[PDB]
Amino acid sequence: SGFRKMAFPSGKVEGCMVQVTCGTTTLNGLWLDDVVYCPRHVICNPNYEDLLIRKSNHNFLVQAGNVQLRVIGHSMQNCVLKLKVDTANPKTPKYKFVRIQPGQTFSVLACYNGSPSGVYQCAMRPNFTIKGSFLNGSCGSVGFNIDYDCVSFCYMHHMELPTGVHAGTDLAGNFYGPFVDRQTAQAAGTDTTITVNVLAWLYAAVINGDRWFLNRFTTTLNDFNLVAMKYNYEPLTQDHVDILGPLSAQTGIAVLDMCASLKELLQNGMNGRTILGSALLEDEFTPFDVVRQCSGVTFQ
Amino acid sequence: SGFRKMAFPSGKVEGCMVQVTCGTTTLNGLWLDDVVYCPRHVICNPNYEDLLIRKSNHNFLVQAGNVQLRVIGHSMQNCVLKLKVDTANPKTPKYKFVRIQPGQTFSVLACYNGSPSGVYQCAMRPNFTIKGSFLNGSCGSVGFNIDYDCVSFCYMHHMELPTGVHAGTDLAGNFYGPFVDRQTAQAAGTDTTITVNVLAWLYAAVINGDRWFLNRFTTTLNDFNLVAMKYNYEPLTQDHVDILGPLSAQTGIAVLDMCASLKELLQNGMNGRTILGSALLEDEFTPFDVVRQCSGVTFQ
Numbered sequence: 001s002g003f004r005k006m007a008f009p010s011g012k013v014e015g016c017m018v019q020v021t022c023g024t025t026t027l028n029g030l031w032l033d034d035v036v037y038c039p040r041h042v043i044c045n046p047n048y049e050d051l052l053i054r055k056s057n058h059n060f061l062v063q064a065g066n067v068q069l070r071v072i073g074h075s076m077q078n079c080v081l082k083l084k085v086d087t088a089n090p091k092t093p094k095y096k097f098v099r100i101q102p103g104q105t106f107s108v109l110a111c112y113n114g115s116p117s118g119v120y121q122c123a124m125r126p127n128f129t130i131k132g133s134f135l136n137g138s139c140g141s142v143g144f145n146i147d148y149d150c151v152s153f154c155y156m157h158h159m160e161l162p163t164g165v166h167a168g169t170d171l172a173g174n175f176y177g178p179f180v181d182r183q184t185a186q187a188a189g190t191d192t193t194i195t196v197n198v199l200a201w202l203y204a205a206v207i208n209g210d211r212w213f214l215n216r217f218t219t220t221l222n223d224f225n226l227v228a229m230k231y232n233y234e235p236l237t238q239d240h241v242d243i244l245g246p247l248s249a250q251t252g253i254a255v256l257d258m259c260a261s262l263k264e265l266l267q268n269g270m271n272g273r274t275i276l277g278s279a280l281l282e283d284e285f286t287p288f289d290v291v292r293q294c295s296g297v298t299f300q
Numbered sequence: 301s302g303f304r305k306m307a308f309p310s311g312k313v314e315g316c317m318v319q320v321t322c323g324t325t326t327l328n329g330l331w332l333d334d335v336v337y338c339p340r341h342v343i344c345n346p347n348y349e350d351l352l353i354r355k356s357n358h359n360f361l362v363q364a365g366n367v368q369l370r371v372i373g374h375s376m377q378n379c380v381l382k383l384k385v386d387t388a389n390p391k392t393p394k395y396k397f398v399r400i401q402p403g404q405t406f407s408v409l410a411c412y413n414g415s416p417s418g419v420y421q422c423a424m425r426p427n428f429t430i431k432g433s434f435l436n437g438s439c440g441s442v443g444f445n446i447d448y449d450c451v452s453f454c455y456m457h458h459m460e461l462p463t464g465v466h467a468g469t470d471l472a473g474n475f476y477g478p479f480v481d482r483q484t485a486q487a488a489g490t491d492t493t494i495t496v497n498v499l500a501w502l503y504a505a506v507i508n509g510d511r512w513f514l515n516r517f518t519t520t521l522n523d524f525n526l527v528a529m530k531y532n533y534e535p536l537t538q539d540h541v542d543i544l545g546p547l548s549a550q551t552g553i554a555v556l557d558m559c560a561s562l563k564e565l566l567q568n569g570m571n572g573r574t575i576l577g578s579a580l581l582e583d584e585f586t587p588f589d590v591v592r593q594c595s596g597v598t599f600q
C-alpha cells in the first residue's frame with residue numbers, strides 16, 4: 001500500500017541525453033539512432049529558417065558524455081532541430097513519438113549540459129502547459145512514458161511562461177498549445193481541474209483506506225457536471241465514467257457515487273482532513289496511473 | 301523555476317536490480333560486483349540462523365533479466381542475505397553503503413520480480429518509517445542518493461506496518477528503527493514534523509515567488525521551539541539554523557524571520573491559500589534538496 005507520485009524509471013532515457021552547443025547557447029538533445037533532436041532555438045523575434053541556412057554542420061557541438069559526435073547533416077522539423085550524426089546511439093531503446101492529450105501524465109527527465117538531474121511526474125494541463133521544474137539550460141529535456149520496453153517520448157522542453165509554468169513541443173516539433181518559441185509576450189490562459197483524474201485519485205484513496213469522504217448519496221452525470229462547472233472542473237463524460245469502471249469495480253463504489261463524494265468535497269471543503277496526505281484535491285493521477293501503482297506493473 | 305518532488309535519475313540502480321527466488325518466495329536483490337544483497341526473509345516467528353544452515357547454494361534462483369546467475373556462496377549480514385554469484389555485475393556503479401538520519405531524503409526505485417516499476421522521493425521519518433508505495437513483492441527495492449557519479453545506497457525495503465507506512469534496513473542489514481523482520485504485532489510509534497525541512501521548503505517557496513506568508517515579525521530560537529513543540533514539530537537547533545544559512549542568504553530573509561512566518565502558519569493555518577501548490581506544510585524537502593533543485597545540480 002501507499003500512494004506516491006511515481007515517475008517511470010529513467011535509465012532508458014538517460015542513455016539518450018546529449019549536450020548540444022551552438023555559438024553562445026547550450027542545451028540538451030535526444031540522441032536516437034543517428035539523429036539528435038533538440039529545440040530549434042539553439043541556433044544563432046527570429047526567422048529560424050533564415051537563421052539555419054546560415055549555419056554549418058560544424059557549428060553544432062554535440063557531446064555524448066566525454067565523447068563528441070560529428071554532425072553530418074541538419075534539418076528543421078517545425079520547432080525542433082534534427083542533427084544527423086555519424087554514430088548511431090547504441091543505447092537507443094525501442095521508442096515512439098506520441099503526442100499526448102491534456103489530462104495525461106508523463107515523466108520528465110530534467111537535464112542540464114546533457115546530464116540528467118532528476119526525474120519527476122507531470123500532467124499536461126488543460127491549457128497545454130505543464131507545471132514542471134526547469135532551470136535555465138533545461139531545454140531539450142524530454143517527457144516520456146514507458147510501456148513494457150517501449151519508450152513513448154511525448155514532450156521536449158522549450159520555455160517558461162511568466163506564471164512559472166512551462167511549454168514545449170511533441171518530438172515532431174509541434175507546440176502543445178498556442179505558444180511559439182519567441183521572446184514575445186505570451187500567457188498561459190485559464191486552466192481547469194482534470195475531473196476524471198481527481199476521481200481516479202479518490203479511488204486510489206479508498207484502495208489505501210481513506211474513506212471518510214464517502215457517502216450514501218448519489219447524483220446523475222448531468223447534475224454532477226453542473227457542480228463541476230461552477231468549480232472550474234472540466235466536464236465529466238460517459239467515456240470518463242467508462243475508464244473509471246475498473247476502479248469502480250475493485251472498490252465496489254459506483255462512479256456516480258464517487259461523483260457525489262466529489263460534489264460534497266467541492267461544496268464543503270475538507271474540514272481539516274487530508275486525502276492521501278494532501279489537503280487539496282489532486283488531479284495529476286490518471287486512472288491508469290492509479291491502476292499501475294495500485295497493481296504493481298513493471299517494465300523491462 | 302517551479303518546484304517538484306524530484307527523484308534522482310535511476311539508471312545506475314536499474315542495472316543492479318535482480319530477481320531472487322527461493323522456495324515459495326520471490327523478491328528483489330541488489331547485484332553489485334559478485335554479490336547479490338536481498339532481505340533475509342526470502343529464505344524458507346523464525347530463527348533465520350537455523351533456517352539458513354538448512355539452505356543450499358542451489359536453492360537460491362537469481363535472474364538478472366533473462367540470464368540466471370549461479371550462486372556460489374551465501375551468508376547472512378544482520379537482516380540481509382549476501383548471495384555470492386560467480387559473475388560480477390558489469391553495470392556496477394561506484395557506490396557506498398550509508399545509513400541516513402531521520403529527516404534526510406532519498407529516492408526509491410520500486411521493483412517487482414527484479415524489474416523497476418517506478419521511482420519516487422521519500423524521507424526517513426523521525427520515527428524511522430518511510431511513507432513509500434510498496435506492494436507485495438517489492439522487498440529488496442532500494443533507496444539511494446547520487447552524488448556526481450557515486451550511488452549511496454541507504455535503504456532496502458523489508459515490510460509494511462499496519463498504518464500503511466514502511467520499514468527497512470540499511471544495506472548492512474540493520475533496521476531503521478525498532479522493527480524486526482517477523483510477522484509479530486509491531487507499530488510505528490508517534491511521528492513528528494521535520495521542522496528544518498519545512499523551513500527549507502518555505503525558502504523554496506520564496507525563490508519561486510510565493511511570499512504571502514512572509515512577515516515583518518521575528519522571534520528567537522527558543523520562543524520558536526516553544527511553539528514548534530505544541531504543534532508536534534521537532535526542535536530546531538542552531539545547527540539547523542546554520543544549514544539554512546545559504547537559503548537565508550539567497551532570499552535575504554533571516555532564518556529566525558522565516559521561523560516567525562512558520563509560527564504564524566502554525567497558529568493561523570493557511571486561510572485557503574497554498575504554498576508551492578500544497579495546502580499543507582511540506583517537510584520532505586531538505587535544505588540540500590532545495591539548493592540542488594533551485595540551482596540545477598546534475599550527476600554523471
Ligand SMILES: *[C@H](O)[C@H](C[C@@H]1CCNC1=O)NC(=O)[C@H](CC(C)C)NC(=O)[C@@H](NC(=O)OCc1cccc(Cl)c1)[C@@H](C)OC(C)(C)C
Binds near residue numbers: 186
Ligand atoms: C531553455 O533552456 C530555456 C528554459 C527556460 C529557462 C528558465 N526556465 C525554463 O524553462 N528556454 C528559454 O530560455 C526560452 C528561450 C526562447 C527563445 C524560447 N525563453 C523562455 O523560456 C522565456 N519565456 C518567454 O519568452 O515567455 C514570453 C514572454 C515574453 C516577453 C516578456 C515576458 Cl514576461 C514573457 C523565459 C525565460 O522568460 C520569462 C518568461 C520572463 C521567465
Ligand SMILES: *[C@H](O)[C@H](C[C@@H]1CCNC1=O)NC(=O)[C@H](CC(C)C)NC(=O)[C@@H](NC(=O)OCc1cccc(Cl)c1)[C@@H](C)OC(C)(C)C
Binds near residue numbers: 327438460481
Ligand atoms: C516483501 O515483498 C513484503 C513487502 C510488503 C508487502 C506489502 N507491502 C509491503 O511493503 N514484506 C512482507 O510481506 C513482510 C514479510 C515479513 C516476514 C518481514 N511482512 C509485512 O510487511 C507485514 N508486516 C508486519 O508483519 O507487521 C507486523 C504485524 C504483525 C501482526 C499483525 C499486524 Cl496487523 C502487523 C505486512 C504484509 O502485514 C500487514 C502489516 C498486516 C500489512
